[PDB]
Design a protein around this motif. Structure first.
Motif, short mmCIF file in Angstrom:
data_model
loop_
_atom_site.label_atom_id
_atom_site.label_comp_id
_atom_site.label_asym_id
_atom_site.label_seq_id
_atom_site.Cartn_x
_atom_site.Cartn_y
_atom_site.Cartn_z
N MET A 18 0.84 -1.23 0.00
CA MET A 18 0.00 0.00 0.00
C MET A 18 0.86 1.26 0.00
N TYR A 19 2.02 1.18 0.66
CA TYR A 19 2.93 2.32 0.73
C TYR A 19 4.34 1.90 0.32
N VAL A 40 4.54 -1.80 -2.73
CA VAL A 40 4.31 -1.76 -4.17
C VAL A 40 4.73 -0.42 -4.77
N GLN A 75 3.60 -3.28 -10.66
CA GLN A 75 2.40 -3.80 -10.02
C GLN A 75 1.13 -3.34 -10.75
N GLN A 76 1.06 -2.05 -11.05
CA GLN A 76 -0.11 -1.50 -11.75
C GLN A 76 -0.24 -2.10 -13.14
N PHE A 126 -1.58 -5.52 -13.08
CA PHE A 126 -3.01 -5.64 -12.78
C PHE A 126 -3.80 -5.90 -14.05
N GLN A 171 -3.72 -9.73 -5.51
CA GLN A 171 -3.11 -9.61 -4.19
C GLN A 171 -1.59 -9.74 -4.30
N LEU A 209 0.21 -8.68 -6.57
CA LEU A 209 0.71 -7.38 -7.01
C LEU A 209 0.97 -6.48 -5.82
N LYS A 210 -0.09 -6.26 -5.06
CA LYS A 210 -0.06 -5.40 -3.88
C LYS A 210 1.05 -5.81 -2.90
N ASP A 211 1.45 -7.07 -2.96
CA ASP A 211 2.49 -7.57 -2.06
C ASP A 211 3.87 -7.11 -2.51
N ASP A 212 4.04 -6.94 -3.82
CA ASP A 212 5.32 -6.51 -4.36
C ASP A 212 5.25 -6.34 -5.88
N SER A 265 5.40 -8.60 -9.37
CA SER A 265 4.24 -8.23 -10.16
C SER A 265 4.40 -8.68 -11.60
#
Length: 59
Positions: free
Chosen positions: A1-2, A5, A9-10, A13, A32, A34-37, A41
């Motif tokens: 979230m901060y 990522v 990652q984007q 998606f 998920q 992605l959001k992890d790293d 990604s």
């Protein structure tokens, strides 16, 4: 979230989603992933291409 990522990652998606052939479970864990790293990604998207096709019988 901060600090979990940034970049990739984007872009992954949309890949995770890739085509209509998929867009159900595979991304549940991939989205998920992605959001992890973002470094991984590329994995989500990389497979996003295989997964979407993994269940794509039609051309």
């Amino acid at each position: 979230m901060y600090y979990l990522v940034v970049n990739k990652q984007q872009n992954a998606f949309y890949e995770v989603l890739n085509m209509p052939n998929l867009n159900e479970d595979q991304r549940n864990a991939f989205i998920q992933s992605l959001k992890d790293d973002p470094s991984q990604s590329a994995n989500v998207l990389a497979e996003a291409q295989k997964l979407n096709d993994v269940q794509a019988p039609k051309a």
